[PDB]
Amino acid sequence: EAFCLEILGSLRRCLSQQADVRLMLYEGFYDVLRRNSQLASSIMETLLSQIKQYYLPQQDLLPPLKLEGCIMAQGDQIFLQEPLAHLLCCIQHCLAWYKSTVHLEEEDVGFEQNFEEMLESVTRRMIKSSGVGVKNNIYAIQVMGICEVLIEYNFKIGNFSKNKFEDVLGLFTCYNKLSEISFLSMGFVSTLLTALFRDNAQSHEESLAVLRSSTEFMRYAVSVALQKVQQLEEMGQTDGPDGQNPEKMFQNLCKITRVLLWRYTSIISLLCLEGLLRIFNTMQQLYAARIPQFLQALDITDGDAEEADINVTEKAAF
Amino acid sequence: GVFEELLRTSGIILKVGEGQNEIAVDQTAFQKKLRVALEKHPSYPGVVNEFISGLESHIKDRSQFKNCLLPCTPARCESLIKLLLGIKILQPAVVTLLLEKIPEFNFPRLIVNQFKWLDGLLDSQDLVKKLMQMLSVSPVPIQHDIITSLPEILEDSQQNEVARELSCLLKQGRRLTVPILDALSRLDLDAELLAKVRQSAMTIVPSVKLEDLPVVIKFILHNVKAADAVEVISDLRKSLDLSSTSQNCVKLLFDVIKLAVRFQKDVSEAWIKAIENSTSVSDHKVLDLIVLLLIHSTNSKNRKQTEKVLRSKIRL
Questions:
Q1: A17-36 residues touching B, CB cutoff 8 A
Q2: Do A13 and B160 touch (CB under 8 A)?
Q3: To the nearest 10°, the Cα dihedral for A260, A261, A267, A273?
Q4: Spatial CB neighbours of B239, under 8 Å, sequence gap ≥ 6
Q5: Could you tell me how far CA B143 lies from the centroid of its own chain?
Q6: Longest CA–CA separation in chain B, Å
């Protein structure tokens, strides 16, 4: 089968060409190496060559990465990034997928190398107009963005780690400092992120309370959920792994609604208001049919007692 | 002398020429062959230079020149120069080889096929300077030849600048008109570099030939058709639209006018302003009626007011 081999080898010449192709590739490498992804070896190989190429896994340097290039200054003063945010989020997602669930080519050797490079990116980031306004816009959008993507990689990187959580805090404080001078790359690390925030506890009350105990990162979590539900509700489909296949959307929608609704109702609450209000609008006007379960998804534990007119009446009740 | 020694890497036969003595492996076999001799076994660079000369004894036999581009069963779709012809350390080396292939030469156009999306090399800017430089000693077949291949797939940082360099050279001939117009159909060597170049385009073909009519029309309209490029349409309607083999001339006029008639919709408004503004009333071209057959009658949904202006001066 020379199909996928010659096809990836043709789209290699889409590896860096004007930086719109770069954005769709950084989005779509993950989908190809997920669903039709028997051939994830060379896929991770292409990501690995690219990432450890423009970005640098060097030691003890100035910036955590080598942003100088990911910018329209990487052309002729033109504002075409070749976005480090794109390839960064793509690296973190598609590596998490291929490595951790793939055995649960660029995948494995890239796995060791990306482990080193990702621990480096965390420790080396958190460890610290008009004319050049090109530089400020491009550089800063990338800086805050790479912060968000690495934030998610860490945010799932540690099960109960206070060290993972500390680096979460550091990335978040960096992001807030990026606010001083946003379409977060937070597909489920801002969708199953908040499960601990609007949760109550499991074990690491010290871990979780060192993780979110700011109200800066708490605002970052609520704002990721808010920006996200809104983009799906009206703008279009979605940002990360779960836009285009709306079954994932409905499932995570029912879940995030459950948790955000709890943290609104029982307990800043203006945010839970503003988000559930945007969301219930998205749920009446996106899942028309699926609404029969989806409203039930917040109020039920198992859908074995009633129908949708029973659902209209009883959900209006609740 | 270590020519077939380079065959030790992944399989290269010292064939007679057109017989592509492949390896039974190609894709990483040639890179193995430029690692084994061209990097490790004979010398770091020295094996590269000696093997260059050692196959260079073969380079008088243009079977091993043109079998490089030709079809013959390779290692398992090219031959020696073309099939396994990729070296990043051999970037400037086979670049000097490209200069050496340039002067005698087509064969240089098959070397431009060998460039046709060439290997992503050490520096496209030195390559682009060299390619344009050895075109001023040779004919526009080699000029427009290498303009074709670089015209879409080229470095794009000095690429768009060198594009504007040739579009600053694009006045003196009508050679670079079509070759520019391909990558000035694909892209823009500058953003209003495109717009200034299309500012070249209006008088760029006032009394042009037959085929330069369809080509320079494809450029003079569809290169960068902005909103105000609708007025662009009007300019052309004044200049070269005196509508005249001959049906082939009509076929090229139609190729331009009708690949644009349903490509970008603005040409609909363009032919509307070409007639209805000041031609579909006062001093009409027969190409006015023809283009009305194309634009003013042949629109998908741009026909209702196409009928309104269609009978508009059709009534008065």
A1: 17-18
A2: no
A3: 90
A4: B202, B203, B205, B206
A5: 10
A6: 86
Q: Is A13 on the interface with B (CB under 8 A)?
A: yes
Residue owning tokens 């080509």? B215
Q: Which residues of A123-135 are buried (b: 16+ CB within 10 A; e: fewer)?
A: ebbbeeeeeeebe
Give the span between the Cα atoms of A153 and A119, in whole angstroms. 10
Decide if B270 contacts B309 (C-beta within 8 A).
no
| Spatial CA neighbour of B25 closest among B38, B7, B48 | B7
Structural method:
cryo-EM
Helical (H) or strand (E) element with B301 = none
Distance in Å, alpha carbon of A76 to nearest chain B alpha carbon: 7
Query: Which phi and psi (to 5°) does residue A2 adopt?
Result: -85, 5
User: Could you tell me the resolution of this structure in angstroms?
Assistant: 3.8
Token duo for residue B106: 């087509």
